Design a protein around this ligand. Structure first.
Ligand SMILES: *[C@@H]1O[C@H](CO)[C@@H](O[C@@H]2O[C@H](CO)[C@@H](O[C@H]3O[C@H](CO)[C@@H](O)[C@H](O)[C@@H]3O)[C@H](O)[C@H]2NC(C)=O)[C@H](O)[C@H]1NC(C)=O
Ligand SMILES: *[C@@H]1O[C@H](CO)[C@@H](O[C@@H]2O[C@H](CO)[C@@H](O)[C@H](O)[C@H]2NC(C)=O)[C@H](O)[C@H]1NC(C)=O
Ligand SMILES: *[C@@H]1O[C@H](CO)[C@@H](O[C@@H]2O[C@H](CO)[C@@H](O)[C@H](O)[C@H]2NC(C)=O)[C@H](O)[C@H]1NC(C)=O
Ligand SMILES: *[C@@H]1O[C@H](CO)[C@@H](O[C@@H]2O[C@H](CO)[C@@H](O)[C@H](O)[C@H]2NC(C)=O)[C@H](O)[C@H]1NC(C)=O
Ligand SMILES: CC(=O)N[C@@H]1[C@@H](O)[C@H](O)[C@@H](CO)O[C@H]1O
Ligand SMILES: *[C@@H]1O[C@H](CO)[C@@H](O)[C@H](O)[C@H]1NC(C)=O
Ligand SMILES: OC[C@H]1O[C@H](O)[C@@H](O)[C@@H](O)[C@@H]1O
Ligand SMILES: OC[C@H]1O[C@H](O)[C@@H](O)[C@@H](O)[C@@H]1O
Ligand SMILES: OC[C@H]1O[C@H](O)[C@H](O)[C@@H](O)[C@H]1O
Ligand SMILES: OC[C@H]1O[C@H](O)[C@H](O)[C@@H](O)[C@H]1O
Lengths: 391, 390
């Protein structure tokens, strides 16, 4: 989308995977979807390093709206869970120097059953602009047909542009087109800063694998449409939560960096381990994700329960990720010709290789003709930065 | 098995899940199956408090044997990877106050394809006892028929008795019987100190879930037969490895306690996190697994993506485990009437509940009319001990 936004993948926090549609503020106050949840996450994004590391957009997902429209036809916040409106929360979030994301649905209802935007695009985009919304997540539930799906996704893009306001536009359009038919990603890049391709993540190694294998399988159709302004969205970061091992958490961080994925943490910043945090705020791995060339990486080799992915970076540099997909035994030896990586270009006549993950380690100079030997933890990934060098 | 052994579930360390069949000692000398790997783990079991915690048996799984038998018919350890022989390793493990296990197969070959004990049960048992082996894990690959399987598990059990040496007898009999017929557990118990029921464990939460699910599914068949001398074996503890979150590791520790399961770590003792060491060595939780009454716990309740398991314990105590099986969201609220726990008698008229897992915390007194409420992490478990007030 040519609105000047998401020149690198958007970065922030989204309530959905960790908080879901918890409406019960009486018995579950600490996890209900409430204005005070958002206000507290906003304070920690600032005091805990998050906004410094580039996490900028604090985003509301589904279940913030009142059961129906006001007597002017406009959406509203829940009166009990968000008594101060969206506009006061936006000021609050903006005062911390952060940006505010909201949620709506292209059809007659949102996914959880709240007011949809069909027949309301212009009114809502405007409403979002008058509130100070800075990103919109646009879901696709309860939609008549593909014709309406495309019409409505295209309409809202124009409506938001037509507001005057810089509002990052995040679509689940390819997801819901999937499939009556294969998405046309050029049409979508024209309308969307980023797009959900595949099924909702949850807090599992299963879910992670399935997204990698989905993308891996479908990379010839999706990797080249991504670049500054429009990204493929493999869904939220779930580091900090419960279902992933440390090694599976490095797999998720390493590969969302390779995929040039937006980075929306969905977790509880009040209760996150020091190692989850160091990982999420890893400056060298974020720099990869945020690399300004903005070409998405891809899967280079698959076999023998190993994968090799690599991303091209600015300045003739490359990120390389090796995955061990064998979930028995221990760290497995993997060796490859340095000439095989980065299209023979990294490492001609040499590259300096530094391991970023699972730990940060300067590894030596490697000549074009050199071999890299590594060892990879079951379900873990090894993440490497190759710097091209005169040598 | 009325051999005086396994009066509480066996505790030790077993190489297979983490080290598998690595025969490559030139390129990976520190992780191949060699006498060295065993020596390292044996001194760490002593120096890092494993043995104080009750981990006693250091056990060799498959891939130790030389490719053929000696001129007199006896199994032999592999001459390059085990140059000193199994007896000397046994001498050595004994010196540290530990006991040594070894591994063989009922059939013609071991699962990796090394010499089986079929036709050699009497000589193999005697060879083992001659070496100072304190435990045999006996696997069921490469076996003709259900007859031979039963004949060989029975025969070996009797060869061992007759050495006059105490040797824990670990059996994979039931596992190899499914899907041909339902095993006779009353019979198995008579010949075995413990028995594997289900597929080999992985470094994965999928694997653990599927062991839990299999056990809770067949619990009517297996729970009551367990007790001092004879245990269901849900396979190795994998805590300390690569594939389980903290919360999944607690689940495995808690559930293996409720199930009165042998506790065989399969992990790298040389490289294990502090958190994973405190779990595996959690005194209060090992005390549950090791309860001298030896009645296996079971699943009480399953619903709305929660499970409740409970185990009866010495002295009118119970253990209760609450698992959250929903893989999305945050900690989720579970409530149950304490009248429903412990057959209605833990907590009549009252009980003191103390949470043990994920963190130790005294919770207070609960009248018979009370409800226990907890928040349970996705893939986590809360483990409680309940003391009846009397
Ligand atoms: C070969 O088989 C024998 C029986 O199948 C087994 O004998 C059993 O040995 C244990 C030794 O601990 C005895 O137990 C202890 O048991 C007495 C009486 O039951 C208790 O009061 C005490 O706790 C005591 O410590 C069993 O009683 C005994 N059972 C029988 C039927 O004799 C042998 O040990 C086996 N031999 C070998 C070397 O495996
Ligand atoms: C409304 O849409 C227009 C059309 O794309 C956007 O204008 C583009 O903005 C970037 C900003 O740097 C320029 O590089 C392009 O040249 C612009 N396109 C055109 C047609 O010149 C405009 O920014 C949008 N406004 C909002 C509020 O999103
Ligand atoms: C939202 O609601 C209305 C009402 O059901 C839908 O509009 C109808 O759509 C049918 C099917 O194409 C049309 O032929 C009718 O003229 C409409 N009927 C009514 C009662 O108005 C609309 O399709 C729904 N929108 C979405 C996005 O699914
Ligand atoms: C997918 O959609 C895009 C844009 O909607 C198509 O590209 C446009 O096609 C028109 C008509 O042929 C051209 O005149 C324009 O130059 C194109 N616009 C853009 C933004 O590139 C694209 O060809 C479609 N692919 C398929 C298979 O339909
Ligand atoms: C499965 C099977 O048929 N088993 C055969 C058996 O018939 C034969 O008599 C025996 C003696 O060596 O060898 C084996
Ligand atoms: C081992 O193989 C032989 C010869 O083929 C056969 O006699 C016997 O049944 C086998 N043993 C078992 C238990 O399968
Ligand atoms: O000329 C139009 C102009 O718009 C503004 C900038 O974003 C430039 O990239 C572009 O050239
Ligand atoms: O796209 C690159 C270029 O676009 C235009 C301007 O807004 C520049 O500041 C920007 O760097
Ligand atoms: O209801 C909210 C929920 O709905 C859709 O399914 C999206 O794909 C999810 O990421 C989340 O927004
Ligand atoms: O090859 C050895 C391997 O054999 C079988 O698969 C057992 O069930 C495993 O625990 C292990 O001993």
């Amino acid at each position: 989308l040519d609105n000047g936004l998401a020149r690198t993948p958007t970065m922030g926090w989204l309530h959905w995977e960790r908080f879901m549609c918890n409406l019960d503020c009486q018995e579950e106050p600490d996890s209900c979807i409430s204005e005070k949840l958002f206000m507290e996450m906003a304070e920690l994004m600032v005091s805990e390093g998050w906004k410094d590391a580039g996490y900028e957009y604090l985003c509301i997902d589904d279940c913030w709206m009142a059961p129906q429209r006001d007597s002017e036809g406009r959406l509203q916040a829940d009166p009990q869970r968000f008594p101060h409106g969206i506009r006061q929360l936006a000021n609050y979030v903006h005062s911390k120097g952060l940006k505010l994301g909201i949620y709506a649905d292209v059809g007659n209802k949102t996914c959880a059953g709240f007011p949809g935007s069909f027949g309301y695009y212009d009114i809502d985009a405007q409403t979002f602009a008058d509130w100070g919304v800075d990103l919109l997540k646009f879901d696709g539930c309860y939609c008549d047909s593909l014709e309406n799906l495309a019409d409505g996704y295209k309409h809202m893009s124009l409506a938001l542009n037509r507001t005057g306001r810089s509002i990052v536009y995040s679509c689940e359009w390819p997801l819901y087109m999937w499939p009556f038919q294969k998405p046309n990603y050029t049409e979508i890049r024209q309308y969307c800063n980023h797009w959900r391709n595949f099924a909702d993540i949850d807090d599992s190694w299963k879910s992670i694998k399935s997204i990698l294998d989905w993308t891996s399988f479908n990379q010839e159709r999706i990797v080249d449409v991504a670049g500054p302004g429009g990204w493929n969205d493999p869904d939220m970061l779930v580091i900090g939560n419960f279902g992933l091992s440390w090694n599976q958490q490095v797999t998720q961080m390493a590969l969302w960096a390779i995929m040039a994925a937006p980075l929306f943490m969905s977790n509880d910043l009040r209760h996150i381990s020091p190692q989850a945090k160091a990982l999420l705020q890893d400056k060298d791995v974020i720099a990869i994700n945020q690399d300004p060339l903005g070409k998405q990486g891809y899967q280079l080799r698959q076999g023998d329960n190993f994968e090799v992915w690599e991303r091209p970076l600015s300045g003739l540099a490359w990120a390389v990720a090796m995955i061990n997909r064998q979930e028995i035994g221990g760290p497995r030896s993997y060796t490859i010709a340095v000439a095989s990586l980065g299209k023979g270009v990294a490492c001609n006549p040499a590259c300096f290789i530094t391991q970023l993950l699972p730990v940060k380690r300067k590894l030596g100079f490697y000549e074009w003709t050199s071999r890299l030997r590594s060892h990879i933890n079951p379900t873990g990934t090894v993440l490497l930065q190759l710097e091209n060098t005169m040598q």
